[PDB]
Design a binder for this molecule. Structure first.
Ligand SMILES: CC[C@H](C)[C@H](NC(=O)[C@H](C)NC(=O)[C@@H](CCSC)NC[C@@H](N)Cc1ccccc1)C(=O)O
Length: 330
């Protein structure tokens, strides 16, 4: 079996991507943010504090005939964002682009942080990291990918995010039509439960490639690209007027400047991120200062290859017995 769904940016800056998901019977369609950095499938619902919902589409378990409450089960999640959500759990049928999974854990939100309430275009999240990260207790739950694995033609899923355009999420197969050249696979570490890999180095613009090991995680749930201070400094030094602002909390640059591309290494292969992808617009409406798409990870504790880097390639998440990450140009 297979599945394929279209993913769309929530705004003109590609802050996040939403993908339609069918939950329950009859089907209740909600637009979820596919997160390969988390392992929980939560959605705004009829249980969510009325004051905490502002325009989102909610899931009403009572209206689904396949919905069943998982007695005593609760959940609580926190994001690197400072974001948080919690509530109860139900089991229901979930379908993504034609691929159906029965008995999937659907975490119903009773409480949602302000950040979420503010985002009217996101109805919930669908975690695609490893199940060891699930926050359901006392009994931990498996992710949607984990539940489909068995039925997939291949235990894989691909990420093809678009730049200021719609993209695709495929389950069970590799569209050899979506990329150019060959796919370069790299080893993945599951120790921390993330799609953790090691990049072989980087290059700034037409500059010489620097061979250095960069351990980070492929996270579709993160907007930007977070790298070590040394690397980030080398990139920004090439942009006239660019500088780190303590008030803004990151590197900013004159909106009129032209950004150089950024190259990251994958084995002997190289993925080039056009400078256009790094521009995050005016820090504030009307401002002549723009926010950079490449920031330091000094305060995060881990390097993150977010949407900024991921959208520049065709990404294969091989969930085989020995997980691997595949990268290809497109
Ligand atoms: C960063 C530290 C937090 C607290 C950590 N949580 C995590 O690692 C969770 C699973 N994953 C995440 O926080 C991140 C992974 C990067 S750091 C590990 N997943 C992407 C994420 N931004 C989800 C999101 C999407 C839209 C809006 C907001 C947030 C924890 O449990 O300790």
């Amino acid at each position: 079996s297979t599945g394929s769904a279209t993913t769309t940016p929530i705004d003109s800056l590609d802050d996040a991507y939403i993908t339609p998901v069918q939950i329950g019977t009859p089907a209740q369609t909600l637009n979820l943010d596919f997160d390969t950095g988390s392992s929980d499938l939560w959605v705004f619902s009829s249980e969510t504090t009325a004051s905490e919902v502002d325009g989102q589409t909610i899931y009403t378990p009572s209206k689904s005939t396949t919905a069943k409450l998982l007695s005593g089960a609760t959940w609580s999640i926190s994001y690197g964002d400072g974001s948080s959500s919690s509530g109860d759990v139900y089991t229901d049928t979930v379908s993504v682009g034609g691929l159906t999974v029965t008995g999937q854990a659907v975490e119903s939100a009773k409480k949602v942080s302000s950040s979420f309430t503010e985002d009217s275009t996101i109805d919930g999240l669908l975690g695609l990291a490893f199940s060891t990260l699930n926050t359901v207790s006392p009994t931990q739950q498996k992710t949607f990918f984990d539940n489909a694995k068995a039925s997939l033609d291949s235990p894989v899923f691909t990420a093809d995010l678009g730049y200021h355009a719609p993209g695709t999420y495929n389950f069970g197969f590799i569209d050899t039509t979506a990329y150019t050249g060959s796919i370069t696979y790299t080893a993945v570490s599951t120790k921390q439960g993330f799609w953790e890999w090691t990049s072989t180095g980087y290059a700034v613009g037409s500059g010489t490639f620097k061979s250095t090991s960069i351990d980070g995680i492929a996270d579709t749930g993160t907007t930007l690209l977070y790298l070590p201070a040394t690397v980030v400094s080398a990139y920004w030094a090439q942009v006239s007027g660019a500088k780190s602002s303590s008030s803004v909390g990151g590197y900013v640059f004159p909106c009129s400047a032209t950004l150089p591309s950024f190259t990251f290494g994958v084995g002997s292969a190289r993925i080039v991120i056009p400078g256009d992808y790094i521009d995050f617009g005016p820090i504030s409406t009307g401002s002549s200062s723009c926010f950079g798409g490449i920031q330091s990870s000094a305060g995060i504790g881990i390097n993150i290859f977010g949407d900024v880097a991921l959208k520049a390639a065709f990404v294969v998440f091989n969930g085989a017995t020995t997980p691997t990450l595949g990268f290809a140009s497109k």
